Amino acid sequence: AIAPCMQTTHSKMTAGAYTEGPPQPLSAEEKKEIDKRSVYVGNVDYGSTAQDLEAHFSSCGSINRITILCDKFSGHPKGYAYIEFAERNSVDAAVAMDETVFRGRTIKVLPKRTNMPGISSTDR
Amino acid sequence: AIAPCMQTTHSKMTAGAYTEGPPQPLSAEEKKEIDKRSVYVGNVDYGSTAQDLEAHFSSCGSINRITILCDKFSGHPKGYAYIEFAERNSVDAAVAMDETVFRGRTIKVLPKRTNMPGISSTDR
Known part of the structure; x- marks a missing residue:
């Protein structure tokens, strides 16, 4: 069982623009x-x-x-988050939790718009 | 040249609006x-x-x-945040901190703006 106890904090990358x-x-x-x-x-x-x-x-x-x-348009700050994964495996595994319950509230997880609003083809 | 369609439109922002x-x-x-x-x-x-x-x-x-x-695709988890205020006073006051040091690092703050390409939902 590995547990991060402090440390591992390293964000010293600004690019410098x-x-x-x-x-x-x-x-x-x-x-x-x-x-x-x-x-x-x-x-x-x-x-x-x-x-x-x-x-x-x-x-x-x-x-x-x-x-x-x-x-905070809602008075109470609501959160929406888009999680972008490295792999397609991960998105599919995450969407399986679509209607899971978290912190007492039901959250909603689905892919960041992969749908058909009409015809969609990379090559036509 | 083969031109099946003459496309000349403006590049509108997608994320945000x-x-x-x-x-x-x-x-x-x-x-x-x-x-x-x-x-x-x-x-x-x-x-x-x-x-x-x-x-x-x-x-x-x-x-x-x-x-x-x-x-974190860069390996190092970095942060950018867009803070949207309720008053124009606040944005002006915040941008005055463009050069400042927070948590021991110099951050950069300047005004943010998105735009829409068009929003419509077709029923039937």
């Missing part, structure tokens, strides 16, 4: 692959920020990126 | 006003979380929404 902004260096296809293996995690409690939130999903695979949005 | 995920996106202008009051907080490390992060910005105004994205 001083104008980083919203993006990260990914090609259009890096972006497609990540959303294909991304999930939407909604109605998450404000208590489950990135560290706690990843832990639950990390059991289903390896996380590549995560985006968490909290709206 | 379009994809709110499964929920239906709130008003277009609610979205505009929030961007106009939004800041980009980058280089925030994985050690900070939403509560801690809000506290620093809450000192400079009232937060309406926040979006935090952490990338």
Whole structure:
């Protein structure tokens, strides 16, 4: 049984642009692959920020990126998070928890929009 | 050259104003006003979380929404956050901290803005 007791904190990577902004260096296809293996995690409690939130999903695979949005438009900050995994295995394993119950509330997890809003084909 | 279709349109942002995920996106202008009051907080490390992060910005105004994205595909888990305030006063006060040091590292804060490509749901 391995348990992280402090340490392991190392985020000293800024790239150094001083104008980083919203993006990260990914090609259009890096972006497609990540959303294909991304999930939407909604109605998450404000208590489950990135560290706690990843832990639950990390059991289903390896996380590549995560985006968490909290709206106080509702007075109470609600959380929605998009978890983007490294593998397709992980997304499929995560979506299986779609209607699981977490912290007393039922959360919802489904892929970050892989649906057909009409015709969709990479090559036509 | 073979041109089956003459395509000339404008590049509209997808994340933020379009994809709110499964929920239906709130008003277009609610979205505009929030961007106009939004800041980009980058280089925030994985050690900070939403509560801690809000506290620093809450000192400079009232937060309406926040979006935090952490990338770990680079191996190192990094953080970027978009803080959306309720007042324009707050965004201006927050951007004044563009050069500052938080948790021992220099972060970068400047205004954030998304836009919509068009939102419609076809019934039948």
